[PDB]
Structure formats: C-alpha cells, structure tokens
Write a protein that binds this ligand. Sequence first.
Ligand SMILES: [Ca+2]
Length: 366
Amino acid sequence: RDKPLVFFNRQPSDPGKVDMAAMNWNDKTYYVGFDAKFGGSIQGKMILDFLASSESSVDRNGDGIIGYVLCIGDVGHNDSKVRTEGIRRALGTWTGSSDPGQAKEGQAVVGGKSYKVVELEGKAMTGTDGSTWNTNSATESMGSWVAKFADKIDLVISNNDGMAMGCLQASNYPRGLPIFGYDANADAVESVGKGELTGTVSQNVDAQAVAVLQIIRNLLDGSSGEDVVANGISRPDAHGNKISAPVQYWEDVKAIMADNSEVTSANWKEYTRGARDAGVRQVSAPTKKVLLTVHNASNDFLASAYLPALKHYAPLLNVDLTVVQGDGQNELSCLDKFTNLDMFDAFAVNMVKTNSGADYTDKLKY
Ligand SMILES: [Ca+2]
C-alpha cells in the first residue's frame, strides 16, 4: 500500500545497521526517535556549563580542584557506559574505560579560571539482591562519601535520576551540594524546581510523540519533500503549531530525531509531571484514522510517558488513534493485532524485533 508508515522508538535494523529495506517501503515512510548516542555528551555539557557559570565558591575546600563522585548504574549496560563516558570526556577524566576506578585527572573552567578535576570515586550501585541502578546503594554510598571525602566533594554525578534522588536521601547530604542526574523523571524535575537536584536530561518524549502525529498529518494533508519533516516540527505549520524542543532530521535514514535536552532551573517547568507543549494547539481539520502499535504493553516508559503523550496530542491534530500492544517477546503479538488496515489512513509501528520490518510491510499488500 501507499499509506504513511511511521516507525518509532525502535529503529528498523540488525540487532547493527539500519534496515533501509524497510525505510524505503515507500516515500511516505519515516522513523521518529531521539539523538540517543549523544545523550552522554549532553549531560557532560550541562555539567561543564554549570561549572563555567560558577564562581570559585563551587570549590568548597578551595584546593583548586573540582572533586566529584560518580554513581554508576551498571558496568555492562550501554546507557550507563555512554553517560559515564559522556561526563568523563567532558571533564577530561576519560581514559578509555567506563569502569569504576578508571579515571585520570581532568580539567574544567570555573569563572574564567582553569581548575583540575578529580573523580574522587566512581562506583557501581548494586543491591544485595544483585539489582543494578540501585537507589538504596546510592543512598548508602553517598552517606559514606560525605564521611570519607567531606569537603573534597564539589559535585555529585549520576548515570540516572533514581540514584541521584537516592543520594539526596542521605541523612548527611551537604546542603546545596550540586548534583546531576539523567532521565528527567517527575520527582527529579520537581527537585530541580526546588533547587535541590541541579540538573537532569530528557529525551523529549513529547517532541517524539508530536512528530509521529505531525509527520502523518503533513503527509495526509498533501505535503511533500521538506514540508513533511519541517512543518509543525522545526518551524510553524499552516496553523502555527510547532514542537518546542529542538529536533533533527537524518535524511539518509529518513529519521526525525529529537535532541536530548538538559533540564535545569532555567526550564524545569517545561518538563514537570503532566507538562505539555504549549506550542501545539487544537487544529480545525478533517479527522484521520491512525493504527498505532506498541511492542510491549508492560514497558513502563511507553505506558507511562510515550502513550499518554500520544493520546494528548492526537485529538489536537484530529487523529483518531487506535492502539494495539504486544507482550514484548514475540513479534506475532503485534502482527496478529495489526489487521483491518483498510480502515486506517496511516500507521505508526513500534516492533519488538528491529529486523521485523518486512513482516509488517507484507500485511500492507493484502
Ligand atoms: Ca575542591
């Protein structure tokens, strides 16, 4: 068939190269995701810009060193390693390894002056039960870090929000000690608003949600070429709607990729629980039917963040959204519910196996 087909959240590929056979299903096929590989770089940037804007006061003991402690989530997990590498490279403490204990003396500018940077300690947070990204171990480690390093700690850095909020639960957390996380969880963004957590990082789920719906509307409304991926996304559409977060377009892979955004005192209100893009308003237009797929009904992120975003923005773009969800293990749990395709004007597919692009395009021929 020749209807719009927007893959999202999981990019068609070998589980490593993009499945360009799927992407070229037709000239109305796209992918929507986010700039994942650069996530660590953005956390690092946030931390560097914070220090750059700081006075000499952030150097608590005034030894000309910016000392930090690092919460590692999982030494074998890609997201942990990317975020560790991201902040270590940014601070110049990177040696080629994301492992704990593997850092060198670094450098960073504070108030126009060069400071040494030392990773006082980086530690994997693991529970007694073996569970990783462990919040309780973070709380305990933070408490011990205060006792051991005391005024040497100038900031705390964490692979995620969960562990960072764990650190803030330490009964002896030094008052006003800067600390940074990652994920932009609700409680984390709230903390940023209260001036406790210093920063975190968002993948902009809302931007991704709107982009899926906007690409579809642009296509069904008769747009072609640059308009399809720009209107309502990186510039206002005919109605004035426009995604607020920055978004990229990767042409060779037909991918609309939201930036990773840092979340600080400067913009936390835009990322709090239930916050929605004020740049996307109700449109007066004919209703269009969209069948949307979810690879796992039990996935917390898709269930708690992505789907609710989709359901909020869809009626504003006059999209009648029908959602079907799989179990998370077999591709059939989605394909079976991927029927009645003659009833819909467009399709958004989130498959469990990235290489299963051909299974869906086959059903689009009947
Ligand atoms: Ca110091």
